[PDB]
């Protein structure tokens, strides 16, 4: 029951989430009926246009992409490429249905959200490849669903934000779609279990060090894949991440994988990319997602620093 | 010469003040110098309308406002109350000109800038006394000034958002005018000099914990003092804090202060205070107010996040 400091919602839901079995002691399927009942929880929402679409990403099969357009806008719209979080194992349009209805309607962009194959029916590396094919083909929805390919953000949040800033490595590898800028919401970087963050907050604040071993090993099949700059891109060299796009990198206080988005800032920084990084007090895992988190002066905070931030990318 | 990751422009202000004699080690009139000549560096300035009013505090004597307007503004503005940094001892209109004309002109604000009496010439209480004295006749001027005091935020950088949060203890103790928000730009909040921050960022990041026991030193040598909530909020009770305006409070990575910011925001947040607490890695103390330091990521997130914070809590 010895806790640091947090939000009332955030100690709530560390709570909630203290009792076994935890979401990752349960089959997979009931996992993801667990996160679909908790966003079932009652928010305030963005009225937005939605389009389901299904993307053909070629070797990596058939995948539903969402389009969240804001309202009565006549305009092409800057394009925001988003990939949600949920351990690899989690998470569809509905568990990240507040978060990316207000980044359109604040940043008033399109997001693009990609309903990537789950961990463990797919391994490393079917969802970072189906992802980077849907952004090969953005240039062919622009026109129809009224956005700029050429005013591209990629945003995620805990994988989602792994797999974004790696969508910047396989876009400069292979010379992809150019991304303007990229915005990783407590990123996983390192699958490395022993960081000063992973030892504080190893239990009592939702997310858990054992949530996370679990997450991964869904995730690959073996470990000469973690070392692998496209499932941990905390081990890029300087030459690896010279020119990726400017970034914004939220950590949370009490997050086991705060210190390892806040090295991966440093990495980037080192290698002379632009960096914006910022950590939140009082704050747990997934605090921009769980609609319960969703008044917390974190949440207003995050989603005021990264849609100013966003914002002002596009006015350009 | 083995520092953490810092913004280059954060690395190359704690590259010039790494030589002896320090700013600390000069007599005050030269640090006073010195500390005006690092701020005619160049920076882009908003444009603004300015006029300095001599204010009586009666007890405390007379001090020097300056009342700072955005350009062709008919209208009645909100109004931030705005308390300058630099230790006491230093510090008044023209160098935290850029950091005050960006608030003014982003906030569409009148900015009241107070020049109080600096240390070691004038001790503690008096500095705290004179900005408490001023914000009670903000009402006398909103008619010529044509601002709107029922809208109104206390700010300050370091020592002054040390006395920016002791302007809402006093306020809430002594009922003086309403003070909506404060915002805090890497405060100090107590007289520990033994902080994990204190010790890791001692040397090489510009503030040095010299520096700031010497600051503290010409402000009160008292233990007694040092230990009032007035000088050191961080000691204050959760009956103390309680029922204190909304705190956005904004801490950089290498800084000795990091710490006491860090927690005097947990305090404000157990007494039930409306807390915004966000830190901004590889940047040093004096972020927000240093020329050279203006095109910081660090600078241009926490001058975003501090200007919309203020514009969402006035609506």
Avoid: C
């Amino acid at each position: 029951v010895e806790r640091i400091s947090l939000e009332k919602a955030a100690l709530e839901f560390s709570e909630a989430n203290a009792p076994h079995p935890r979401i990752y002691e349960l089959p997979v399927e009931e996992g993801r009926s667990l996160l679909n009942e908790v966003q079932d929880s009652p928010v305030v929402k963005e009225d937005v246009d939605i389009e389901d679409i299904a993307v053909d990403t070629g070797e990596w099969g058939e995948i539903n992409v969402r389009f969240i357009r804001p309202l009565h806008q006549e305009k092409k719209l800057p394009v925001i490429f988003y990939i949600h979080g949920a351990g690899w194992v989690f998470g569809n349009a509905h568990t990240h249905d507040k978060l990316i209805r207000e980044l359109a309607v604040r940043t008033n962009s399109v997001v693009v959200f990609s309903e990537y194959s789950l961990s463990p029916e797919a391994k490393y590396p079917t969802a970072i490849e189906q992802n980077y094919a849907v952004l090969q083909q953005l240039k062919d929805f622009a026109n129809d669903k009224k956005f700029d390919v050429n005013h591209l953000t990629v945003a995620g949040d805990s994988v989602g934000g792994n797999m974004a800033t790696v969508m910047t490595l396989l876009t400069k590898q292979r010379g992809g779609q150019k991304i303007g800028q990229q915005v990783l919401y407590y990123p996983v970087t390192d699958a490395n279990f022993d960081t000063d963050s992973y030892n504080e907050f190893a239990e009592n604040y939702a997310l858990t060090k054992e949530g996370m071993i679990w997450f991964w090993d869904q995730y690959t099949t073996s470990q000469e894949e973690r070392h692998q700059i496209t499932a941990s891109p905390l081990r890029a060299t300087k030459e690896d991440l010279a020119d990726l796009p400017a970034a914004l990198i939220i950590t949370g206080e009490a997050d086991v994988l705060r210190d390892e988005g806040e090295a991966y800032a440093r990495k980037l920084r080192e290698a002379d990319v632009e960096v914006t990084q910022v950590r939140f007090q009082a704050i747990i895992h997934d605090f921009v997602m769980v609609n319960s988190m969703n008044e917390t002066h974190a949440t207003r905070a995050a989603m005021s620093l990264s849609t100013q931030w966003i914002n002002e990318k596009n006015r350009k």
